[PDB]
């Protein structure tokens, strides 16, 4: 029972491909030839954060756009105040090398993970004042790439074993186990309706999963390098993926095909982080050319250049209200652009 | 500008001073990345340098300098994505089982992929040919001609001091420099050879930070 299943899979792939090429009525790149873009965006760093020691690898925002959590490679979760430029929280991690950190939607819990294969969930509203270890989600056989909080009791995680998981804070065991991918997942991104989430693997495979059952709905295999970044649209209908080919690809969930292709000739480096704005107009991406790019989601042209950092841009994130954008590189410097 | 704002600024300054105190001891130590396949003697070198989780850190101080050795415990054989977290480290100790000739080609391929990595162009890879006693026993008492045809035309150098595997490794290394060394499963020299290499490696950093090289 090998050749028949292979030929059936090939026939289904051909069917999906012809359906996608038939549903391609008109690309957005040629339709947006009439809308007037904003032009040239010049962002200036309002406040600077020069307290980190090792390479900053991840960051996230909470409910209010004032607290900014960030993770460093020396096992440090530093939560800064974006307005007053002060250090709010400092959490010494037992695992030095980390790659992910998130903030609960209520502003009470934080997450961390990495090469330790154990996701540590810390609580900030403890009566002991200091930050203590609250939850230790273990059971994976791969490095933790990204993690995002769905609510005050559940959290989705992506491991290096090509499998994503959904853990429950109350239980602490494998609550939802999704089907394994071909490549290892590198990033995660949740939807505003906390029902669906799209994740890109190490190979050219971006799969959409639900929060109730472990079944995949859409799979995008259109790429040419390793995807390292992903983000969700504020409306929950599109998502942009960044890979090592310096060209971002914006797909949608309503048609299951490629909509926008952000590409340029003078950029051959990799992509680390991708994040949308509040309205979804200015798409901010982090390239390995010591600079950050801000493209237009409809024009797909050069709109904003951020040459403030001096090392490889590692992570970036826009607040829930789009008031400011945080960016962290390997120079242990957090910059808050506006 | 109120009293609570001043207290928050004072707490931020205290956290900054704590981070600087941590950085002070963080700069005074070195960080090494231990890599190797399953056939290598990585566990032997771990249990020799004593003077669930996909990472394991070993803290040992010799010659008044600490070395934090990070080794993958429960991770896959792929080292393409999680390798970027080991940048700006002191050295990458790559262990190779030179005794088994059947699994030596994959070891050479892994060494070539690590040396020619995208982000490891500024990190020095130190070779450790483990199981020297078994390597000597398999020669004085498996043939290399059955695996490497270039062994018949290669002989021992006359200008050396009493080399095929080392030559095959330095051919890819020279094409940061490598440091091939020979050690056994009971030899306690691994605690010193590192100090014999890093003292030079960091020296090269002193030639790059001070703009001397």
């Amino acid at each position, epitope marked *: 029972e090998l050749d028949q299943l292979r030929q059936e899979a090939e026939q289904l792939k051909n069917q999906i491909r012809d359906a996608r090429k038939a549903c391609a009525d008109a690309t957005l790149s040629q339709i947006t030839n009439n809308i007037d873009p904003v032009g040239r965006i010049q962002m200036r760093t309002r406040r600077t954060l020069r307290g980190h020691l090792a390479k900053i690898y991840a960051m996230h925002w909470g409910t209010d756009s004032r607290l900014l959590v960030s993770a460093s490679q020396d096992g440090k979760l530093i939560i800064w105040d974006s307005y007053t430029t002060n250090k709010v929280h400092a959490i010494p991690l037992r695992s030095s090398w980390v790659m992910t950190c998130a903030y609960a939607p209520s502003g009470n819990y934080v997450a961390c993970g990495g090469l330790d294969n154990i996701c540590s969930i810390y609580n900030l509203k403890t009566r002991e004042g200091n930050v203590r270890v609250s939850r230790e989600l273990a059971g994976h056989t791969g490095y933790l790439s990204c993690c995002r909080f769905l609510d005050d009791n559940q959290i989705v995680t992506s491991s290096g074993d090509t499998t994503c998981a959904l853990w429950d804070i109350e239980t602490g065991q494998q609550t939802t186990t999704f089907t394994g991918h071909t490549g290892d997942v590198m990033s995660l991104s949740l939807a505003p309706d906390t029902r669906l989430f799209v994740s890109g693997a190490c190979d050219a495979s971006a799969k959409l999963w639900d929060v109730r059952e472990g079944m995949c709905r859409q799979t995008f295999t259109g790429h040419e390098s390793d995807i390292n970044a992903i983000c969700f649209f504020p409306n929950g209908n599109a998502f942009a993926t960044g890979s090592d080919d310096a060209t971002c690809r914006l797909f949608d969930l309503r048609a299951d095909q490629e909509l926008m292709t952000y590409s340029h000739d003078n950029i051959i480096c990799g992509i680390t982080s991708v994040s949308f704005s509040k309205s979804g107009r200015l798409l901010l991406a982090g390239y390995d050319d010591f600079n950050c790019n801000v493209w237009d989601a409809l024009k797909a042209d050069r709109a904003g250049v951020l040459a403030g950092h001096d090392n490889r841009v590692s992570c970036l994130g826009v607040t829930d209200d789009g008031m400011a954008v945080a960016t962290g590189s390997w120079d242990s410097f957090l910059k808050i652009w506006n | 500008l109120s009293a609570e704002d001043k207290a928050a600024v004072e707490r931020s300054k*205290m956290i900054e001073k704590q981070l600087q105190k941590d950085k002070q001891v963080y700069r005074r130590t070195l960080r090494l990345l231990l890599l190797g396949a399953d056939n290598s003697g990585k566990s032997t070198i771990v249990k020799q340098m004593r003077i669930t989780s996909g990472i394991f850190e070993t803290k040992f101080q010799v010659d008044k300098v600490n070395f934090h050795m990070f080794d993958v415990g429960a991770q896959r054989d792929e080292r393409r994505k999680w390798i970027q977290c080991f940048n700006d480290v002191t050295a990458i100790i790559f262990v190779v089982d030179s005794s088994d000739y059947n699994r030596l080609q994959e070891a050479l391929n892994d060494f070539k992929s690590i040396w020619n990595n995208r982000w490891l162009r500024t990190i020095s890879v130190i070779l450790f040919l483990n199981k020297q006693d078994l390597l000597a026993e398999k020669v004085l008492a498996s043939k290399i001609e059955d695996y490497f045809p270039e062994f018949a035309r290669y002989t021992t150098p006359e200008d050396a001091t009493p080399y095929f595997i080392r030559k095959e490794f330095v051919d890819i290394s020279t094409a940061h420099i490598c440091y091939p060394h020979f050690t056994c499963s009971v030899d306690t020299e691994n605690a010193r050879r590192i100090f014999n290499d890093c003292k030079d490696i960091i020296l090269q950093m002193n030639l790059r930070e001070y703009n001397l090289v």
Partner: single-chain antibody
Amino acid sequence: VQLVESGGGLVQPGGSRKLSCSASGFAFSSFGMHWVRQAPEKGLEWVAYISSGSGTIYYADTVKGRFTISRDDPKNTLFLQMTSLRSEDTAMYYCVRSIYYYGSSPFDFWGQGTTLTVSADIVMTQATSSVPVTPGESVSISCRSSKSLLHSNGNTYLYWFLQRPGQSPQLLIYRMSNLASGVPDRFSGSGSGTAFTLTISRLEAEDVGVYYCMQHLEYPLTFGAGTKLEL
């Protein structure tokens, strides 16, 4: 979370008294500590404040320089030395913990307090001091300050403390409207930068006591006259 105070009793004026406070349940080195006195049949009165690591130490305008306060982190202890006591220092002293950051609840937990017997600042003028109301109905306690507490940062400093007979005061709302922890949602705060109001939807048997108001705009911490609810 527990604060054990010791060093109370009777003393003669002119001597010296060293009160001790031991913390058990949290890291004492990362908590700002406030010593606050309360006279019998009177209101609260802040005495001294110390930050983490003994960086900034502030005293009240009436006891500035005469009293001293120190802390020991390796043993989690707080010492308060008072010399040349007058006829007013005979009161009940309490130790309060508070961390200062965005989202924190300062003055959340109060110590047990000890009694000691002997032998400009933004004052809080409470227009209401005795509002008898049966439990189960909504009550409104109003207060007025001599200066606008609404700082330019956007945070209004308005702390409420409910002191029950025989129990230390407990924090209800630390900001103008941000409810604290360990307190039911029945308490709500509102008003402008000058006149503040605390509304309770329903009262219970354990919802009796004096309601003190405290401002934290400047370093001189002054309390109100005290508004208690009778039955």
